[PDB]
Each structure stands twice: as structure tokens, then as C-alpha cells.
Amino acid sequence: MMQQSRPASDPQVVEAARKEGRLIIYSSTDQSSAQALLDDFRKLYPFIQIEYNDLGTQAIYDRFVSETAAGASSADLLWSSAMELQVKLASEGYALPYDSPEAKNWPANARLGNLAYSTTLEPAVVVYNKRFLKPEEVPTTREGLARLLQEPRMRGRVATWDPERSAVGFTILKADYDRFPAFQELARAFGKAQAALYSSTGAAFEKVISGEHYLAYGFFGSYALLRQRTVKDLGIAYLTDGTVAIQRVAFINKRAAHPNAAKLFLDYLLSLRGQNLMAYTALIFARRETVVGEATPQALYKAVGGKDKVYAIPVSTEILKNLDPAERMRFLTFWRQAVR
Ligand SMILES: [Cl-]
Ligand SMILES: [Cl-]
Ligand SMILES: [Cl-]
Ligand SMILES: [Cl-]
Ligand SMILES: [Mg+2]
Numbered sequence: 321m322m323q324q325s326r327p328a329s330d331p332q333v334v335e336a337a338r339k340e341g342r343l344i345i346y347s348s349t350d351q352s353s354a355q356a357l358l359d360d361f362r363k364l365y366p367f368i369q370i371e372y373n374d375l376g377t378q379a380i381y382d383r384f385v386s387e388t389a390a391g392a393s394s395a396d397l398l399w400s401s402a403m404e405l406q407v408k409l410a411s412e413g414y415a416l417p418y419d420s421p422e423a424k425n426w427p428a429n430a431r432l433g434n435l436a437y438s439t440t441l442e443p444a445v446v447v448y449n450k451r452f453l454k455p456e457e458v459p460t461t462r463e464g465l466a467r468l469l470q471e472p473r474m475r476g477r478v479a480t481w482d483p484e485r486s487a488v489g490f491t492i493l494k495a496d497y498d499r500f501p502a503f504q505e506l507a508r509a510f511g512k513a514q515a516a517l518y519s520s521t522g523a524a525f526e527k528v529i530s531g532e533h534y535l536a537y538g539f540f541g542s543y544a545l546l547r548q549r550t551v552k553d554l555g556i557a558y559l560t561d562g563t564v565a566i567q568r569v570a571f572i573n574k575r576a577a578h579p580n581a582a583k584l585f586l587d588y589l590l591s592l593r594g595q596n597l598m599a600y601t602a603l604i605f606a607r608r609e610t611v612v613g614e615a616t617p618q619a620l621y622k623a624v625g626g627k628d629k630v631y632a633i634p635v636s637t638e639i640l641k642n643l644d645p646a647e648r649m650r651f652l653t654f655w656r657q658a659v660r
Contacts, residue, residue, distance in 0.1 A: 321600070321612040326364065327591035328421040329584050336580035337368060343581040344371045346380045346395040348402065348488065349568065349604070350522065353546055356601045361588050368581050376519070377402035377487035381409070388414065388575060396582035399439065399570045399589075401540070402487030403633055404642050406569035410436035411637050416572035416579055422590035429634035430567060430607065438567035438635045439589045440598065442605040443620050444492045445541040446557040447525065452477070452534040453555070461561040462502035465537065469509035479524040479536040480510060482517035483655060488566065489519065491633065492538050494642050494651050495564045499631045502561060506537075507658035515659055529554065540566075545603035545615055558623035565620070565632045567607065 329337075347354060351374045358370050373395070375383070380400050387394035398414075400406050409415065415435040423437055430438035446465070448458050459465050468474060481489025496503045516533065518524040521543045527533040529551055541556065548554045570589055572582040588594045592611075598604040600613030609617050621627045633639060641647055 322592040322596040325591070325593045327584070327587040327593060329587045330421070333580050333583050334365070337365065337578070337584045340578035340581045341367060342369045342371070342578050343585055344373070344394075344396045344578065345399060345585070346373045346375055346384060346397075347399040348375060348377045348380060349399060350374060350543060353542055353602055353604055357589070357594060357597055357604075360593070360597050361585060364588065364593075365584055368584070377405060378485075381405045381487065384409065384414070384573075393577065394575065395573050396576040396578045397570060397572055397585055399568060400488075401442070401491065401566050401568050403491050403566060403569055403635065404639050405487050406436060406571065407432060407635065407637060407639055408643065410569070410571045411640070414571070414574055416574045416576060416582070418572055418583055418586065420583075420587050420590050422587045426590070429636055431635055432637065436569050436571035436635060437586065437590060438607050439570050440542070440568040440604055441565050441607045441617055441620070441630075441632055442568065443541040443558065443624070443630070444496070444538045444564040444566070445544055446535060446537055446559070447528055447539060447544045447547075448535040448555045448557065449528050449531050449533075450553050450555045452531055455555055455557075458535070458555065458557045460557050460559055462500055462506040462559070463561070466502070466505045466509035469506075469513040474513045474534065476514050476516075477534040478510060478513045478515040479518055479527050479533045480515050481538050482519050484652065485517075485519040489538070490642070491566055492564055493655065495631060495633050496538070497651055497654065499564065500562050504654070504658070507655060510537075510659045517659070525554075538564075541620070542602075542604040542615060549603075558620070560625050560629065563620070563624045563630050565605075565630050567633060567635055569635055
């Protein structure tokens with residue numbers, strides 16, 4: 321649905337983007353998942369060449385800060401799941417202020433005024449290998465997963481984030497810790513099962529697919545849906561006690577060489593066309609409710625047993641509390657003691 325519509329970017333912005341002719345993206349969205357968006361954007365605007373830099377969340381931050389400080393060529397658009405890092409940059413002078421004509425109905429907690437925008441509503445899910453755990457054996461609660469991880473067969477068979485090496489692994493597990501008391505019991509059960517910690521979804525998924533691990537906790541439902549299309553052994557379980565949802569944050573570099581191309585791409589991501597392509601084809605869980613496909617808010621809400629079971633991390637300067645050293649210290653001390 322909406323596959324032929326045109327985002328409402330101002331015609332002067334389209335003409336300015338044509339004069340630029342190029343768009344440099346730094347993104348943590350795996351290119352496997354991003355590629356259909358890039359292809360569809362080029363169908364709309366064939367006069368823009370896209371350079372897609374598929375990078376780690378901490379690496380995007382470090383590279384962009386370093387390049388900016390050097391006065392050097394950097395990204396036009398930054399698109400990352402490490403919400404706190406994106407909100408920090410966009411609240412420190414790095415962002416081009418732009419009021420997207422596609423974001424008029426965004427809630428105030430899904431945008432930083434005109435500086436940065438939510439593009440997705442992506443759940444942290446459980447993935448497992450059906451050869452080793454049947455669907456009916458996989459709990460959908462933190463307390464139930466804690467019980468499963470007492471079992472001898474689960475020792476060495478669990479993957480989760482390393483929040484000390486992945487910035488979004490921090491986002492997700494910090495939010496879980498903050499919102500769900502049962503997270504503490506589950507983290508001790510990660511210690512019991514000798515959970516292996518990964519800095520990327522692909523590294524954890526490769527282990528689940530090989531059966532080195534049976535179950536991975538906290539990775540993106542978007543990537544799981546897309547992997548399941550080619551790996552029929554991959555199962556997905558949604559948490560019914562409460563689901564953390566991240567919002568991938570996009571903003572335009574204030575110092576972009578191609579700011580208008582970046583405007584068009586932001587407006588594309590936020591548009592009904594882009595959000596429908598997420599939900600239907602890319603299998604990225606869309607931010608917009610008015611979407612058709614597998615990767616939709618309605619589908620997430622049905623899977624978890626209602627919208628009130630989803631904690632959507634806001635695109636807000638309030639989330640920078642998570643970067644406070646004492647707040648980071650409390651979480652990481654708890655984590656490191658529980659998972660050892
Ligand atoms: Cl609002
Ligand atoms: Cl890793
Ligand atoms: Cl549209
Ligand atoms: Cl909508
Ligand atoms: Mg990635």
C-alpha cells in the first residue's frame with residue numbers, strides 16, 4: 321500500500337537536492353534491511369547517488385564527531401538505533417533544523433522539535449532455533465525465561481547484547497532494567513546459563529542459526545523477520561510481560577555537503593510511502609500506524625497483548641539521563657555482577 325505516493329518535500333528542496341546529486345548516509349540499519357528503502361528512494365529521485373555506510377552505533381558517533389572537529393567531509397544524514405547518542409548529537413549543535421512536512425502528526429515525544437525524528441518503532445524480541453527449542457517451550461516473560469535458563473541444556477546456549485560494546489545494546493538493556501523489575505532475575509539467569517554477549521544482531525543470529533546458541537534476547541524484531549524469510553528454523557517470541565521498543569533516530573548534519581538530498585531522504589523515511597515500504601518489504605517495524613505489512617505497530621501490539629505492554633523509548637533530551645555517569649554506573653555494576 322502507498323507504493324506510488326510522493327513525499328510532500330517542497331519543490332525547491334527537490335530542485336536543490338538535484339543540484340547536489342549525492343547523499344552520504346551513516347547508518348546502523350543493516351544494509352540487508354535498508355536496501356529496499358534505498359532502491360525505492362532512487363526510483364523517486366533517480367538523480368541522487370546514495371553512499372550507504374553501514375556502521376556500528378558507537379562508530380557512527382565517534383567518526384561523525386571526529387570528522388566534524390577536523391572540518392572534514394562527513395555524512396549528510398545520520399540514522400542510528402543508539403537513541404541516546406543520536407539525541408546527544410542533535411541537542412549539541414550537530415543537527416540541521418528542518419521541519420519535515422511528513423512529520424506533522426508525529427507525537428512530540430517522537431521528535432526533538434525540528435532537530436531529529438523517530439523513523440521506526442522496533443521491538444526487542446527473543447529469537448530462537450526451532451531445531452533446539454520448540455515454539456511451545458519458549459517463554460514470553462522475563463520470569464519464564466529466567467526459569468528456562470536454569471535448565472542444564474541452556475548452559476552456553478544463550479546470546480544477548482554486550483551493553484559495554486554496543487551503544488544500542490546499552491539503550492535496550494538500560495530501558496529493560498529501568499522499566500521491568502523481572503529484568504534483574506533474568507540478568508542473574510544470564511549468569512547461570514553463561515550467556516555470551518554480542519555487539520551486533522548479526523553476530524548473535526549467526527550463533528542461533530548454527531545452534532551454538534539456541535536463544536538470543538533483546539535483538540531487533542525487524543532483523544528477525546527479514547532473517548526468517550531465508551532461515552525457516554528461526555523463531556520469534558514477543559515478550560507479553562512488557563516489550564522495549566526503540567525508535568531509530570534520523571537527523572541531518574548541520575554541516576552536510578548535500579543538506580537538501582538529506583531532507584528528501586528524511587521526508588521519504590517519514591512518509592506513508594517509506595513507512596509502508598518498511599512495514600511490507602524491508603520488514604522494519606514502522607513508526608506510522610497507517611501501514612500494511614508484517615512489521616507494523618498493530619502487529620507488534622497484537623503479538624505482545626496490547627499497546628499498553630510496549631514501552632517506546634522517547635526521542636527526548638530526557639533519555640540523556642542514561643549517559644549520566646552515576647546512572648550508567650548503577651546499571652553496569654548490576655549487569656556485570658549478574659551476568660558473570
Ligand atoms: Cl504530542
Ligand atoms: Cl560481537
Ligand atoms: Cl507518501
Ligand atoms: Cl500514520
Ligand atoms: Mg547494524
